[PDB]
């Protein structure tokens, strides 16, 4: 009796609902034997990735507990318009506008929600930094000068995941058979002046390459660094180096991965040393300053989403599939959508476009009316002039 109402009526409801704007995922291929959902996560190179799908213990007001017994009313006690016996009740075709506009209400609520966090993380994207000893190799090297190097731990903790995100071959190990030509080919392959050290001892032309080109060698440890290089100068010495920070912006320079505008750079140069609680406070302030009311549906949705704890670390975050095994896969043209290759700091294209103009505004000399340092000097002030 009901079968016509299902196959010939309800199916179309499903077929429209598949095209609703927010029904964005693939749910089921129709083959129970081999279907696993594609699993995206929002991976920051710093903190742990956050899967979109998981057993996170939210019941969503009990919605995730599935009661199968609902089928009994569906057969044995529910009217359908198609099953007449025959009243011929007219079919209802609901206005698109209601579900549509509530979908849009959700979307705009979410973008406006994320905005302050996304903006701040755009600024700080260069700010992650690694400890870097710079051993000197010349008779009159300045403290900045020499061969930059970092421990392998700092490499894994920052540089590697970022290389995974930029989708490049991993940097070559250098073995002391390494030609400067090979180090060059490696760097132009990965676009980052970096090589993993492997075994000693690095030869002179390679050393002059690494020095002249500011390439960052990556030692397993600092146990006997000068032994690792064949230094003809004998200028290199295990005690002769200078430890210093090295911003990720001083390494990576990708357009929608790491904001490396000199404006944003000097803006960060102005910043006090920051903890994550401070950054969170900055975001919470911008949100305080720019909160703008919702539309009643957006108030209902913000209320429904609950308190926005936002524990997830969005610093340099990206959208990437995990393997079911639990590893994070690299982006794949041939499977992941183009929209996922770069977060673009999670800002709209018009925002980035206006943003570049803003950066021109924020470095104009005329605006720079915060002045640094004063001369004290006892002196008569006939004919004053501020300049």
């Amino acid at each position: 009796n009901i079968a016509v109402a299902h196959t010939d009526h309800l199916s179309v409801v499903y077929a429209t609902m598949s095209n609703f704007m927010l029904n964005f995922t693939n749910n089921f291929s129709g083959n129970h034997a081999t279907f696993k959902p594609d699993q995206y996560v929002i991976t920051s190179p710093e903190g742990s990735y956050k899967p979109i799908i998981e057993r996170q213990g939210e019941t969503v007001d009990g919605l995730t507990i599935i009661d199968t017994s609902i089928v009994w009313p569906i057969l044995c006690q529910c009217t359908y318009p198609l099953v007449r016996q025959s009243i011929m009740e007219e079919i209802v075709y609901p206005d698109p506008s209601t579900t549509l506009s509530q979908s849009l209400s959700v979307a705009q609520v979410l973008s406006k929600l994320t905005l302050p966090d996304a903006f701040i993380n755009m600024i700080l994207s260069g700010g992650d930094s690694v400890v870097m000893r710079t051993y000197q190799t010349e008779a009159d090297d300045d403290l900045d000068e020499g061969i930059r190097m970092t421990t392998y731990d700092q490499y894994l903790s920052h540089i590697r995941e970022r290389l995974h995100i930029t989708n490049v071959p991993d940097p070559i190990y250098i073995t002391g058979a390494s030609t400067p030509d090979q180090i060059a080919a490696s760097v132009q392959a990965t676009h980052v002046a970096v090589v993993l050290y492997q075994s000693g001892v690095i030869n002179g032309p390679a050393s002059t390459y690494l020095r002249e080109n500011e390439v960052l060698v990556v030692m397993p440890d600092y146990y006997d660094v000068v032994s690792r290089f064949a230094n003809a100068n004998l200028q290199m010495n295990n005690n002769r180096y200078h430890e210093s920070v090295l911003e990720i912006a001083d390494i990576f320079d990708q357009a929608d991965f790491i904001q490396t505008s000199d404006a944003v750079r000097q803006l960060r140069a102005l910043m006090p040393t920051l903890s994550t609680s401070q950054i969170r406070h900055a975001i919470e302030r911008i949100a305080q300053i720019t909160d703008v009311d919702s539309t009643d549906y957006g108030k209902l949705t913000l209320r429904f989403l609950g308190t926005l704890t936002r524990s997830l670390k969005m610093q340099n975050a990206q959208i990437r599939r995990i393997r079911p095994d639990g590893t994070v896969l690299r982006y794949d043209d041939q499977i992941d959508i183009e929209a996922f290759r770069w977060s673009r700091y999670f800002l709209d294209e018009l925002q980035l476009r206006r943003l570049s103009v803003g950066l021109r505004l924020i470095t104009n000399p005329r605006i720079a009316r915060r002045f640094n340092g004063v001369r004290i000097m006892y002196l008569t002030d006939d004919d004053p002039d501020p300049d």
Binding site: E46, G47, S48, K50, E54, R55, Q56, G57, L124, G127, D128, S129, V130, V131, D153, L156, S157, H158, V245, E247, R268, M271, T273, L274, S275, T276, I279, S311, K313, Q315, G326
Partner: protein, 99 residues
């Protein structure tokens, strides 16, 4: 050790993250001291970066190691399978708490 790499690796999680200070003010003050050259291990140096904090980053690698450890762990009972999935989230919470 040739066959026990995961154990040595988990054991590296315990390595202290600080540095070995000399007790210089105590030596200038001529304070009593049993050691020939007085020293002390500070558990952690102050954050020399502007955003990155090396302690918190170390705990990120530790907890990531530990989570991939729990993930690799075989279980028999269903309930163990559930707790195994839950501890990973717990670890993530910790890591944010430490940061």
């Amino acid at each position: 050790l040739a066959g026990a790499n995961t154990i040595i690796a988990i054991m590296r999680l315990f390595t202290p993250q600080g540095f070995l200070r000399t007790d210089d003010l105590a030596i200038a003050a001529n304070f009593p001291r049993a050691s020939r050259n007085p020293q002390t291990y500070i558990p952690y140096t102050n954050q020399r970066g502007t955003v990155t904090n090396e302690f918190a980053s170390r705990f990120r690698t530790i907890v990531a190691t530990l989570a991939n450890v729990v993930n690799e762990r075989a279980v028999q009972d269903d309930m163990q399978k559930a707790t195994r999935s839950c501890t990973k989230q717990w670890l993530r919470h910790l890591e944010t708490q430490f940061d």
